[PDB]
């Protein structure tokens, strides 16, 4: 019952204490079918080359974390064939298994939230100002919430209590979400389907969803126990499509 | 005996989150590893090993 | 499914925590029959006098142990009336149910094999010299392996890496086996038929097997946990024959 | 009232591998002992018990 | 299997760590029919306002506590609207559901019984004295055993040895009762039907039963884990039935 195997392309993952799974809302990914179609050319379909497991760098969670965020994709953009099939591209269309990675002993206490938010628009740390690129993204690298207001230019307002997005953090509960309390299980999964309001789109212009990881309970522990506990990320595409082939782009 | 021609590739570790552990459990701790083959294995061409060897005869 | 018990004549053991059992090559001990049978004369089986666990005594795994074994028979002929029904017989046979126990809390940790090797032939510590009977076997007691070379007259060269054998010891798992692992288990069954080229022999002049229990990862704990930490084993003969009856020999 | 001609036996107990803990938790304990009769069980010829008594009436 | 929730009115009790059920000496409660009924008034049965489950006072577990009592009735004789039923009539009979709470982390230890006992009649700590109704009940509060030999007037002779009763205490397990092992449940449950030689009685002159808590192992711990560990108390009525309503009595 707690025990659970995924496999994609040449990937595995594995484990024996996870709770279920999260569908997000009730739809699995699938292809884009003839009357839900506008764009005309035959379009690609690499299948395994795409659909797989790649796993992102980990962070240290501390004793005094506020949390942290990636944003997709462009998180996935230098990962083998998918950003590379990203790149010489118009048009893309995939949704996704997410799969996040924290254990402890039994003599460690702490809770995370892991929360998956499609649109998450972000307000800047100047009231009449906006937001550069870089402070929304530094790709497989996350950003780092704080823990009181924030000041600087072209920068995002970045305290925990509003999400960086004008709302009290507690209600982020409608969104597709689970738990990791210490506990109970050590890892999260969440499969989320491609969700937009136009049937394809380009995939370097918009972000289409904001991963976040927030502590609610903070990691705490006793005499000599391990200091040192990681998080780790690991994002599969599904349902991989493209369309458009023209010569590679540049940032 | 492997060449540049056969190769194979490699294997890899990494830390995906961390080791946690409460207080008065010891902080490092060890991996094993065991080896085998599946059941679409299989050898050919017979030849002597090179790992046991004599100088001379009653040995 | 991790409960089990096992009588045999007036012995019963539990366990709480057993992972399965080994069957040595899906070979369940019995007696011998008529199309392959060499002596003539009609055998005694006791049946439950002989058939019952008998205790041998514990050793004690510290933080540097580099293993134990035994050699059977020869460590059960002072048990009771197996060891009497061996001192007045020529021939016997027999099969062995063996269970191993060591239980620890769930703050310590460390790994055992236990192996059972059917006709283990020892070398000399002196390249041109031979072992004595005593440096192989000391009945209940165990011997010990070192942790570098050894020296001594007519004693067996005792580094664990080589076993005692010339092998590599990483490679024992060719023969029956299981592992104590002290976080998943804490104990370790094998039962094990007659094997022999002969269907029978003398008990006292023929060694059959060496029971081996090797740590591979130490024993390992932190502040104020428990220290002694011992290890027992606890053998049943299964299927017992004798012939060949005369008066009682003396070493 | 047993006497040596219907005598029934001992029992023992020993360690078969002894007692392990982790860091952090108390190193000695305790066990408990509980008696019963079987399906198999019974008695006959009644009498009084020694373990009551009194030296004069009104008790 | 370890779970269980139990409901009575507007009330409710889960479980995570249970072993079982005691039903007394497997029979449920139930109201008193006609062919067993002397009392020729029609009775009231409150049905939802009387059977539920209130909780009474904690006691905390030290590393030296002999142990404690409650009588019932007489420790609900203060609670809401069963208690005013008990006010204002002659006659009543209820049977019981206990429910006995303790937690503990998996690095401690200790082991308390959990017992019922119908028509515990106490005797003094002077042979030639009588005892007082406050040395029996102090309601809602516990009365605490003794180690040693008790004195003063009116009373309870109070060492744990004897149960107050001049008894063996290891004995008192031919009563209804269940143990708390602190490596094994949390809790315990008793359902106790309506034991007397008559069909109804008075709820003020009459104890019923007698709840006892004795720890057999003490209380151990070490380093730094928690010290506090508190026991609580949960009993609702079933079936209960009043007779005889005139003006209420007064203490």
């Given at each position: 019952?707690?025990?659970?195997?995924?496999?994609?392309?040449?990937?595995?993952?594995?484990?024996?204490?996870?709770?279920?799974?999260?569908?997000?809302?009730?739809?699995?990914?699938?292809?884009?079918?003839?009357?839900?179609?506008?764009?005309?050319?035959?379009?690609?379909?690499?299948?395994?080359?795409?659909?797989?497991?790649?796993?992102?760098?980990?962070?240290?969670?501390?004793?005094?974390?506020?949390?942290?965020?990636?944003?997709?994709?462009?998180?996935?953009?230098?990962?083998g064939?998918?950003?590379?099939?990203?790149?010489?591209?118009?048009?893309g269309?995939?949704?996704?298994?997410?799969?996040?990675?924290?254990?402890?002993?039994?003599?460690?206490?702490?809770?995370?939230?892991?929360?998956?938010?499609?649109?998450?628009?972000?307000?800047?740390?100047?009231v009449?100002?906006?937001?550069?690129?870089?402070?929304?993204?530094?790709?497989?690298?996350?950003?780092?919430?704080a823990?009181?207001?924030?000041?600087?230019?072209?920068?995002?307002?970045?305290?925990?209590?509003?999400?960086?997005?004008?709302?009290?953090?507690?209600?982020?509960?409608?969104?597709?979400?689970?738990?990791?309390?210490?506990?109970?299980?050590?890892?999260?999964?969440?499969?989320?389907?491609?969700?937009?309001?136009?049937?394809?789109?380009?995939?370097?212009?918009?972000?289409?969803?904001?991963?976040?990881?927030?502590?609610?309970?903070?990691?705490?522990?006793?005499?000599?126990?391990?200091?040192?506990?990681?998080?780790?990320?690991?994002?599969?595409?599904?349902?991989?499509?493209?369309?458009?082939?023209?010569?590679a782009?540049?940032? | 005996?492997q060449?540049?021609?056969?190769?194979?590739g490699?294997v890899?570790?990494?830390?995906?989150?961390?080791?946690?552990?409460?207080?008065?459990?010891?902080?490092?701790?060890?991996?094993?590893?065991?080896?085998?083959?599946?059941?679409?294995?299989?050898?050919?061409?017979l030849?002597?090993?090179?790992?046991?060897?004599?100088?001379?005869?009653l040995?």
């Amino acid at each position: 019952d707690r025990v659970r195997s995924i496999t994609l392309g040449n990937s595995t993952i594995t484990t024996q204490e996870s709770a279920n799974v999260v569908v997000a809302y009730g739809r699995w990914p699938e292809y884009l079918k003839d009357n839900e179609a506008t764009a005309e050319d035959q379009p690609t379909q690499p299948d395994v080359a795409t659909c797989r497991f790649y796993t992102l760098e980990s962070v240290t969670w501390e004793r005094d974390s506020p949390g942290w965020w990636w944003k997709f994709p462009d998180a996935l953009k230098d990962m083998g064939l998918f950003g590379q099939n990203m790149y010489y591209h118009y048009l893309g269309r995939a949704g996704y298994t997410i799969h996040v990675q924290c254990n402890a002993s039994k003599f460690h206490q702490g809770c995370l939230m892991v929360v998956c938010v499609p649109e998450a628009e972000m307000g800047c740390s100047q009231v009449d100002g906006t937001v550069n690129e870089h402070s929304l993204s530094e790709g497989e690298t996350a950003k780092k919430f704080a823990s009181t207001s924030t000041n600087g230019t072209n920068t995002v307002q970045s305290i925990v209590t509003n999400a960086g997005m004008g709302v009290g953090v507690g209600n982020l509960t409608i969104f597709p979400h689970q738990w990791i309390n210490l506990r109970t299980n050590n890892c999260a999964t969440i499969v989320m389907p491609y969700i937009n309001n136009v049937p394809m789109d380009n995939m370097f212009r918009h972000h289409n969803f904001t991963l976040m990881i927030i502590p609610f309970v903070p990691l705490d522990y006793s005499s000599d126990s391990s200091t040192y506990v990681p998080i780790t990320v690991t994002v599969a595409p599904m349902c991989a499509e493209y369309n458009g082939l023209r010569l590679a782009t540049s940032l | 005996q492997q060449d540049e021609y056969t190769s194979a590739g490699n294997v890899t570790c990494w830390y995906q989150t961390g080791i946690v552990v409460p207080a008065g459990t010891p902080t490092s701790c060890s991996i094993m590893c065991f080896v085998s083959a599946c059941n679409d294995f299989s050898v050919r061409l017979l030849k002597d090993t090179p790992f046991i060897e004599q100088s001379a005869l009653l040995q």
